[PDB]
Amino acid sequence: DTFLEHMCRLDIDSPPITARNTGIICTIGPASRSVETLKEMIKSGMNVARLNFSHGTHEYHAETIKNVRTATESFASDPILYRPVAVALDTKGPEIRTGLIKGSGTAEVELKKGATLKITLDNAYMEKCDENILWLDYKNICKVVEVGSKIYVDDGLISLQVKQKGADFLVTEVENGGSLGSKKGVNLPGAAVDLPAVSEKDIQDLKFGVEQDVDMVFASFIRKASDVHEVRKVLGEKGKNIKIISKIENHEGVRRFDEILEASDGIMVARGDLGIEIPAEKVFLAQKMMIGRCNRAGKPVISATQMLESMIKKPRPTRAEGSDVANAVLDGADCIMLSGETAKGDYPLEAVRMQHLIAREAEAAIYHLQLFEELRRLAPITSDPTEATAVGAVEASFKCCSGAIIVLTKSGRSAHQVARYRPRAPIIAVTRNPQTARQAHLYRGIFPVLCKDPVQEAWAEDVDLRVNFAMNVGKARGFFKKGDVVIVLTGWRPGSGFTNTMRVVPVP
Amino acid sequence: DTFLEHMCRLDIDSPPITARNTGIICTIGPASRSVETLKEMIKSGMNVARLNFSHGTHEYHAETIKNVRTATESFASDPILYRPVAVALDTKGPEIRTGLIKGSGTAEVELKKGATLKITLDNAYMEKCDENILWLDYKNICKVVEVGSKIYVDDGLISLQVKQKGADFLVTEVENGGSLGSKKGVNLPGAAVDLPAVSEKDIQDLKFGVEQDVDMVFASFIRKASDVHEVRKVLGEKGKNIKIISKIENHEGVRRFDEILEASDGIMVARGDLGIEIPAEKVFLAQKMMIGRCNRAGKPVISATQMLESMIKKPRPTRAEGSDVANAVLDGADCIMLSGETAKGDYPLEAVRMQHLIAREAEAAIYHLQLFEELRRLAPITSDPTEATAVGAVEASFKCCSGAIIVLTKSGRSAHQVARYRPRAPIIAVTRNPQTARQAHLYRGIFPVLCKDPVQEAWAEDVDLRVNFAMNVGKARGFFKKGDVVIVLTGWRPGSGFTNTMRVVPVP
Amino acid sequence: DTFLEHMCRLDIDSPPITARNTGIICTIGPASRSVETLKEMIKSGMNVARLNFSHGTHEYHAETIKNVRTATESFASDPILYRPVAVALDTKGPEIRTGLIKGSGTAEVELKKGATLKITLDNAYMEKCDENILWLDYKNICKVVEVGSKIYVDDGLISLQVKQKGADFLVTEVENGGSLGSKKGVNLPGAAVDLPAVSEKDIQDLKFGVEQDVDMVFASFIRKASDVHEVRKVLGEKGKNIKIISKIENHEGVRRFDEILEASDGIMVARGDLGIEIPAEKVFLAQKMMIGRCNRAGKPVISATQMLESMIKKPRPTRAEGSDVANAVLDGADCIMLSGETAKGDYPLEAVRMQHLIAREAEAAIYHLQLFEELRRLAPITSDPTEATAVGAVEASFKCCSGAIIVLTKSGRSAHQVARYRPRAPIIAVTRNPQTARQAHLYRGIFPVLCKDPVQEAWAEDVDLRVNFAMNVGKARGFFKKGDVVIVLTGWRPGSGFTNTMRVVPVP
Amino acid sequence: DTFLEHMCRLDIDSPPITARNTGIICTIGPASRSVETLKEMIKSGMNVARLNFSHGTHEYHAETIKNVRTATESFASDPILYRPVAVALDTKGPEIRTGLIKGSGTAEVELKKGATLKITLDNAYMEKCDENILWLDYKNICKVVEVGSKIYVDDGLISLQVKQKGADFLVTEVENGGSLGSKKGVNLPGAAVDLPAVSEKDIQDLKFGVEQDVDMVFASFIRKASDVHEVRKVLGEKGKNIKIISKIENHEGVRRFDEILEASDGIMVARGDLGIEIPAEKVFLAQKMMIGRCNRAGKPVISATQMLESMIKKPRPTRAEGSDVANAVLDGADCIMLSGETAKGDYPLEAVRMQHLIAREAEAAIYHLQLFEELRRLAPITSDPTEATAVGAVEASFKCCSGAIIVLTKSGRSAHQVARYRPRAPIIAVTRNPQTARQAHLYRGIFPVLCKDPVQEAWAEDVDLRVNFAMNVGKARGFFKKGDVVIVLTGWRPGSGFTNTMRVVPVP
């Protein structure tokens, strides 16, 4: 009825009645590139393998994608239970990274409050940083910094405000402290950055991605719409179909968020990079704002970083990491991302699993019909057949309590359009295009299904075969039973430009 | 918006930007049964022809039907512009009536105020009525009426008050003077009048109605469900498919309205008969209530019995009758009924043309999305395929700003199912079944269209036959043009089931 | 709940539970200037005596106002039951009137379809018009007419389209026909008018009004906001407090309706003058539009002309005059007006009474809380103490089912502001300013009460005395009983610029 | 609007344009009971001081109260800027606790995974606990626990699994390693733990609470209404006026929540205790439900037990705790509670200051008129004077865009009555009664203000005393300025009755 009536009526001992609508992106690192580790991850809800090109070589990310695909297709033998799994390339982007401190890639020299540390960029101490003296990537720091500007190191625990500029060197106080350590990153919040959004390394990484048939790019440190356009002209014609997800990692990208969203296929909210750049008492508005617009606009949005970073080293998360994530789902994020817990973890399965749990359970508190009616209200009058067919399909899904909204697409477009409006019922997307099954996982509520059957002489016949596919899938995965109802969205005629037929059909 | 704003921004100087949705019912009498006259009337907007069986032999009304079918079909050589026309039989009923005035001649005597009238029941004075003895044929008048009771003779114009009750007579003072002719009808407001709702005449008349394939019965002085049931049993299973419209003409009907509606296919508010048997000020609440229940019940209701009464003898009406019909059409009426204006009148055509104009001009003060959003969440929720397909279709018509909702069933039932959500787009109902094209004028917003084609021996090709028909009609008739989007509703097959294919098709 | 649920729930045999909120303006003429006739009219709900300065002298309207006041104060002895009665001056305004036809002020010469009639304005036939030849007021008709323009005579039944222009004379066909008769009016729909909105006669009439302490002016044929401003500069400083009601009697005033409403204190909709000037299939939108804006803006609006014009000569109105009026109340008119039925009538009491009945009964179909919530929603953020106090007072009146909203004002302003928002509960306005008690009757829902008690030394005491007045008034008139609730709106402190105190106080 | 738009148009870069409405509760321990420290905390936002009676003698907490009263009143020489401060007693309850570790010293032993622990009940080992024998003081541990049961020692950090049940002991495998000190508390999730809700200690502690005029009791491990009733009977009629907040810390409480709420003055969600006894993913639904019921019930609810847990030993928090408190305040919390951060922490002040900042920044994602329009038509409708005066006052605050709603009762009850409609303007509650100024921090949006003046011997002058006080406070404290409009609520007199004078006063 009311939103409040709907929170009051929640029952913690009622069962999970929904299957899980929000997607899980896992970051694949040393702890999760074994094929066996990944088979389990896929079995515990992984849907997108993130590769962080901020660290490592090409032969290594290619081994990593080979094991992801080895595990993903161990399931292929029975295409009903087969879960697609997408590969995501997260670019490096305009980073600043520290040296090796002693000559060693595993050291940490422990800075002390009040102490003094000279930044050098003498290209000499590239691997000699100790307690004083410190080397950096950014050649032109001595230009955008000023005598008081604050510099954060590692994800941010080690802080320090400069006292002495230079032209070659720089010297500074230490508010905070801790460990320095090696190959760490540096932030310069509230300080300009003349690094390009696409370095020549990031160009090479993108093109690699095209060669490897990745399904999405996570473009780092996007600040303005030219940065998106560059990523796409690199991906070029060969990767006009790769989805670009801009990462909002600084204040500008929030300020310039609308034009970033125009140019991009979806948005990643990097909550930690933000909670360094802008005061933290405000990230959570930014997130909420940036999710809502991505929902007005029916573009995926990914909530990321500092999710369960206590499952790097405990097998069970703080009850407030739990609440953090479960509220990202409620704000209407499309997907959730794990960085350290699945990459460097001592318990990566435990994290993937807990994430599926938390997120299944947050949908108990989604008021699905308020969402829908708000998102319909806010939709424009279109002359798009496929848009109107989606809206009707969702109305109907609510007046039946549809078990599903079976949607046949090659594009993926038409299953996206239906999910735009947040049906409570799951969208079973039936495709023959393995790229579209992998990319579908971005969009909340799409359960992609990959048909491998050959195309039939008579298209009528063909449609029935795909739809019956989807219905054995639903019966099996548990979404419904004989004699329930579904919406089915198809074309009338082959090579109809659009998905313009809705049938309200009882499960057989 | 508000409703109040939707008025504030009305524009008289603007041109009607909606079709006429309300059906025009016409009472056929001697001024309007020539074939040429009925052809010109059908041209001007007539949708239903009412025969009034209180007057006339079966051989008379059989010829009047003959000419209406003649006229109606003169246009049948161009399906695009053939307009179907329904044939309604209105019953005599439990009427009280006067005897005859004596002599021969201009059969009329003057009833002067404050003077005296013995109502007698002696069948000697049956043909010897005058200003002192007046015979009527209700034999228990004397027991159901009392002293001080009113008696309205000739259709309300004359009032008597009952001064003295006798054994088998009554002495009355004339209170509303007038002039009395022969066989004119009497109203005993407030009396327990006990005549059967179905007389032996009414039985032979309904059995006539079936022999002539009439489409609706307007049944008179209905008081209770048992009355509707007796009419139905009489129509029996040779005429099960005839629509029965109960006429509410007295207080017990308004009282028992609810049970009368459940038992009936539709309602007629008879405001003149009801203006006699009720405090005339209370009438306009009676109608507002009974239109209201009828709309929530999804049952057509007709607003009647005096609409444009000046035009018996004047070509144009007093704007108060125009505000009267306009507010009946806004109140919720599906049909308006013309009675004297088109039966015995001098301008049966300027009457049809004016009513068409007033209904088409009133529809602008109808706030249409208001009506939808409520009727979506008033009328039975959460059910079965057909009602989910219909709602799906209406939310689509609203999203894509459809120019028409093209509906294929043969009963009519699924086109009703849609009209019961008051979409803003006209519902073109395509049927091969002439009765349902005639009968569907009762439902507001439905535009019957009769496909006279043989059936293509393949379901989808038959469907596109009909849809392409509806399209060409709608383009000819002005509803939509090339490039607009229409919604389409159909069978899953000819397996029966129900109607469960919605489609959003651009207009060729 | 819904609007439709609220129409369905109407009961015609439940009692009138409301007292009558809409006001009644009666036109005082030969049949109603006796003091005894008027005492009864006041006793049957008259609230404003309209004097039509279109006919008659000054000594005559002054006799007429003397008898209105004689009857109004026969009730004054017991100020609880005393009903105030306001005098309204309806100007003549830029009229065109015909001659005397034979030399006699009572003749009628009966024009015939197709016939020929010369208009002359030779100032010679001022009183000789017969069947041919016809004299007019308007000197410059031969300028704004053209060879085909249509001229209507009497309220409009006699029509005629010119065939021959001139410089001095004019000659014409006769569509329609009937009686010509004497001192009749002429309309020139769709034809310019160089008559002034304020003739020198209308100046004199206004100033007379000021001398006689009229309470409102009904300004005729207002076309633009300069016309309002002229009426007020005439009324001048001595009549800055006389309320000006513009009459919208032609197409322009509808076109220029907004600026007319700015300049004026309220609007009269003259439905007959309109239904000649603009097609009649559109008056009823104009009316509806013009009432709604007058409600958005909290200015009184009066629905007028052709109300019950069958109670000029029958003691009981057409059931469709009844429906006409009862729908004006529903559209939200503030007041209702009778012209012929109370002026020239053979049954003026019967009309005043039926009007009270019809209008009491229409409020059964007002959804009072939808009104309020729409009118609140549509209100601006004001920093007006008195506006906010009114809105809260009305909310409260709904959360109690207030018997009344007792409002103490001198101005009248604060009782107007409360009524702006259409409480269901009646507004008892307690004033010492007899002008404000008389003018209050314009505003729907104000039941003015005139306190004659002297001002008390202590203002606290004084307020209690006026409020207890109002509560004996309510107890007596029937609005409520001991132990019910009311809202009471007063000032805190004397000579507070405003009514800023709301008390929710139980009737004693 | 939509709710979704209200997010889409959030602006991080904008400055907080609302006051803090949520009360900050602080747990006073050894890091925060000096008088100087409490003065600085009260300055930074503390509204309530919580004593935790699980630890400490009566002479200890009596001195801690002494200093809180000292600090609190240092500011009392300027009413304008004295902030009242409530004193909350939190009970020990049915706690299970460990014995002591042997020796003396740094009383801590290491519990290593996969190793063994005999839980014994022999009061010989009561002070001779170690890594093998661990004594606890719950004597029926053995019958309510089972094999495979978990046992969480020291506040969740340590988990044991029950390998072997004995007669009077248990053998357990250590699953979450750790370090164990003395007298640390045990959780037996899922066990029928039968200790009394009110122990003999808790009785002497509540009787202390009354001797010291505390204002609220936070009562722990409440499971059923009878538990609340036993606490109430103990507080007896010397402390009838003390507010009892039930603490929901186990599953039976969440289960029986509804009865617990009826019996209680308010709720505390204890998310850490609740995160142990429940699947931690289910917690965030539990809270959302229990905040929800509490808001519809118009009963304050506190969100607690881990809010900013980093700041025990770090000056600023992990943004995830910040998103955590922000979403508790949006969920509906009236108060936030700080526990370790301000009791034993190193930065008790940077914690108060940060929480103030996070609550004040979160209130922008609160959609306020949404909350009103529902709470107006959810919460008991159509009644009695006081609730009609309160709603009147809120609709006014919204119309005139009020800067404050200034409320005079002495109990507090009428200021609650208003806060229960969530107005957008802060409620300045003016009382002469210090307890109600302290106690009213529990209610969101209420800003207590204590008038220390004697009573003017004339009701209205007393009223203007207080109102002019509230005005000057509100101007000093920033809420509104000269020329803004405030709403005022008051007695009709000191006759009792209730509160029934609303007033809309401009600001001097």
Side-chain angles (χ1 to χ4, degrees), chain A residues 187-224:
Chain A
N187 278 270
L188 277 65
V193 163
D194 59 19
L195 269 290
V198 192
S199 58
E200 255 280 335
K201 194 230 196 282
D202 289 323
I203 289 171
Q204 295 315 123
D205 287 352
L206 291 163
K207 179 36 88 193
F208 178 80
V210 188
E211 300 314 320
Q212 300 268 339
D213 204 358
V214 306
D215 313 293
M216 51 205 84
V217 161
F218 298 164
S220 293
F221 293 131
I222 305 291
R223 300 159 94 74
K224 52 193 181 303

Side-chain angles (χ1 to χ4, degrees), chain A residues 216-262:
Chain A
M216 51 205 84
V217 161
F218 298 164
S220 293
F221 293 131
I222 305 291
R223 300 159 94 74
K224 52 193 181 303
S226 81
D227 295 3
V228 192
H229 295 133
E230 290 176 59
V231 186
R232 190 110 49 195
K233 185 208 144 274
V234 192
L235 289 161
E237 170 92 49
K238 256 189 78 188
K240 57 182 180 179
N241 266 71
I242 299 175
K243 296 291 199 285
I244 297 173
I245 309 303
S246 292
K247 291 166 75 184
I248 308 302
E249 311 208 60
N250 42 57
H251 174 291
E252 194 176 354
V254 188
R255 152 168 92 75
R256 303 190 80 153
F257 183 80
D258 279 332
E259 67 163 59
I260 298 178
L261 173 58
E262 179 266 340

Side-chain angles (χ1 to χ4, degrees), chain C residues 450-469:
Chain C
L450 186 49
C451 198
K452 291 253 167 83
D453 283 304
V455 161
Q456 319 274 297
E457 200 190 4
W459 177 87
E461 201 86 0
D462 201 48
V463 186
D464 291 313
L465 155 59
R466 278 168 274 161
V467 167
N468 209 266
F469 179 30

Side-chain angles (χ1 to χ4, degrees), chain B residues 13 251 281-282 293 296, chain C residues 5 8 12-13 251 361:
Chain B
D13 312 336
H251 190 262
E281 73 257 20
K282 284 145 146 318
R293 291 172 190 170
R296 159 185 77 173
Chain C
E5 254 307 308
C8 298
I12 80 184
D13 311 320
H251 174 291
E361 201 192 38

Side-chain angles (χ1 to χ4, degrees), chain B residues 246-494:
Chain B
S246 309
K247 282 168 66 172
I248 311 286
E249 321 187 69
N250 41 36
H251 190 262
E252 179 163 25
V254 178
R255 214 192 101 232
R256 307 192 111 80
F257 186 78
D258 275 326
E259 92 185 1
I260 282 168
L261 184 60
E262 89 196 323
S264 315
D265 276 293
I267 294 307
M268 178 186 291
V269 179
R271 281 108 54 88
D273 311 84
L274 212 50
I276 302 176
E277 314 257 337
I278 282 178
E281 73 257 20
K282 284 145 146 318
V283 158
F284 84 107
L285 277 152
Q287 160 164 311
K288 290 207 156 255
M289 173 260 284
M290 293 182 271
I291 293 194
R293 291 172 190 170
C294 285
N295 274 2
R296 159 185 77 173
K299 288 204 161 151
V301 67
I302 304 163
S303 188
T305 193
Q306 44 190 17
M307 303 303 269
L308 261 65
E309 288 293 12
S310 64
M311 298 164 113
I312 308 197
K313 75 185 314 289
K314 210 244 161 160
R316 301 110 166 175
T318 88
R319 55 140 288 296
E321 299 155 315
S323 212
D324 200 291
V325 156
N327 269 273
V329 163
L330 281 152
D331 282 356
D334 314 271
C335 303
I336 318 304
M337 199 187 80
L338 282 180
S339 310
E341 303 80 339
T342 82
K344 64 161 156 293
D346 299 5
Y347 305 96
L349 258 70
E350 290 98 322
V352 183
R353 277 155 170 153
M354 197 63 31
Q355 272 203 5
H356 166 106
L357 217 55
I358 296 166
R360 164 156 187 139
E361 196 66 47
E363 273 187 68
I366 296 200
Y367 200 175
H368 269 103
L369 205 34
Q370 185 170 295
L371 269 57
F372 178 54
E373 308 133 300
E374 54 194 74
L375 294 160
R376 181 198 40 216
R377 298 134 79 165
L378 272 204
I381 75 186
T382 301
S383 306
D384 83 348
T386 321
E387 214 80 31
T389 316
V391 163
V394 180
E395 249 297 332
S397 93
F398 281 117
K399 169 67 149 145
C400 75
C401 210
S402 187
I405 298 187
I406 294 158
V407 185
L408 290 57
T409 197
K410 290 304 157 271
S411 41
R413 177 225 58 170
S414 83
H416 307 346
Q417 229 156 344
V418 176
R420 201 241 181 180
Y421 289 122
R422 296 281 190 254
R424 205 150 216 163
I427 285 166
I428 285 165
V430 188
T431 193
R432 285 177 158 80
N433 176 352
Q435 191 162 67
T436 81
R438 289 188 307 265
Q439 280 187 340
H441 285 304
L442 279 173
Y443 297 71
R444 172 232 169 70
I446 307 186
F447 297 64
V449 155
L450 185 43
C451 188
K452 270 184 165 106
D453 278 334
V455 177
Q456 308 322 279
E457 315 219 0
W459 177 67
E461 277 181 309
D462 193 17
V463 164
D464 291 314
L465 193 91
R466 291 172 273 164
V467 174
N468 208 329
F469 179 30
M471 215 80 49
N472 261 264
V473 161
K475 264 141 84 204
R477 309 260 283 277
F479 292 113
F480 45 81
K481 46 151 64 147
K482 182 181 326 193
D484 304 351
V485 201
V486 307
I487 317 288
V488 169
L489 262 161
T490 65
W492 51 286
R493 300 279 140 164

